[PDB]
Design a protein around this ligand. Structure first.
Ligand SMILES: CN1CCN(c2ccc(C(=O)Nc3n[nH]c4c3C=[N+](C(=O)[C@H](O)c3ccccc3)C4)cc2)CC1
Length: 283
């Protein structure tokens, strides 16, 4: 009962891990060990509806079918014991939005991030999105809060880690990440992830600000459907802002695909005038 890349899978295909092999270590979702493999353990509340149950199963099926370095791996599940577990790659850096906020330059850490760090995050997630696009999977909620980092320090890799919106489709709408045609007609295509990536790019280069500062969801909806776009984040290089504004083309067919976005990110990455730009320091 779940189809991805033209292949079907069901609960039977999930890799069940004996509960006795699984130890919880600490809350982070928990850090856990499988018998020694470090994992994150996502739990289903025992007090939940059968729809929560089906939601949890679908989440497991979706993440287990992906195979890509910028999408969080599923080690397995433990569904035959209660509470039910999904076992996931442990991402010690935590979520991207929190990371940017915590790790932005300050006097105590004046060079905590550089432009190249942000470009590598952008590349990482764009590579994940390209894999989803080429496999015809529409994510529908590409946003910093949904991405995870392998570790806090140098060599960190960013990955897409949450697929709940796609799971649900398979006041809570992520309006600020959605293109005009998703509001109006409720039409989604891979061009809709392109728009959302544009907004994630603004999040990254703003070092974790909420998009459309000062605007509520409905004000954003009217702004965007009237042609309004966000200004550049502070100190954002022109070439990077231009990737964003191309992602935010009104017509879906005018937005770049992720192969092109990756090309432009790689280009920014080799340009000394981009990567030698200092990030703002937060006081
Ligand atoms: C100073 N710091 C830095 C370190 N820190 C953390 C905070 C959170 C985490 C964390 O949740 N790591 C995760 N690893 N794998 C998964 C995780 C969440 N998953 C999920 O499935 C979650 O549902 C999810 C998915 C995407 C984005 C966020 C949450 C799968 C790790 C370190 C605490 C504060």
């Amino acid at each position: 009962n779940y189809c991805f890349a033209g292949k079907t899978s069901s609960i039977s295909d999930l890799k069940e891990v004996p509960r006795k092999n699984i130890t919880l270590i600490r809350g982070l979702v928990y850090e856990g060990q499988v018998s020694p493999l470090q994992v994150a353990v996502k739990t289903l509340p025992e007090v939940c509806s059968e729809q929560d149950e089906l939601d949890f199963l679908m989440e497991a099926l979706i993440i287990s079918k992906f195979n890509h370095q910028n999408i969080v791996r599923c080690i397995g599940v433990s569904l035959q014991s209660l509470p039910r577990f999904i076992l996931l790659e442990l991402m010690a850096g935590g979520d991207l939005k929190s990371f940017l906020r915590e790790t932005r330059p300050r006097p105590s850490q004046p060079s905590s991030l550089a432009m190249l760090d942000l470009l590598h995050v952008a590349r990482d997630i764009a590579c994940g999105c390209q894999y989803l696009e080429e496999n015809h999977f529409i994510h529908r909620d590409i946003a910093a809060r949904n991405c995870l980092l392998t570790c806090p320090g140098p060599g960190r890799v960013a990955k897409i880690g949450d697929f709940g919106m796609a799971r649900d489709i398979y006041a809570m709408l992520p309006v600020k990440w959605m293109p005009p045609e998703a509001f109006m007609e409720g039409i989604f295509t891979s061009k809709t992830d392109t728009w959302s990536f544009g907004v994630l790019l603004w999040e990254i280069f703003s070092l974790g600000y909420m998009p459309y500062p000062s605007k509520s969801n409905q004000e954003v909806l009217e702004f965007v459907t009237s042609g309004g776009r966000m200004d550049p984040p502070k100190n954002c290089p022109g070439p990077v802002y231009r990737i964003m504004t191309q992602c935010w083309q009104h017509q879906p067919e005018d937005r770049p695909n992720f192969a092109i976005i990756l090309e432009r990110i790689e280009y920014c990455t080799q340009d000394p005038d981009v990567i030698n730009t200092a990030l703002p320091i937060e006081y």
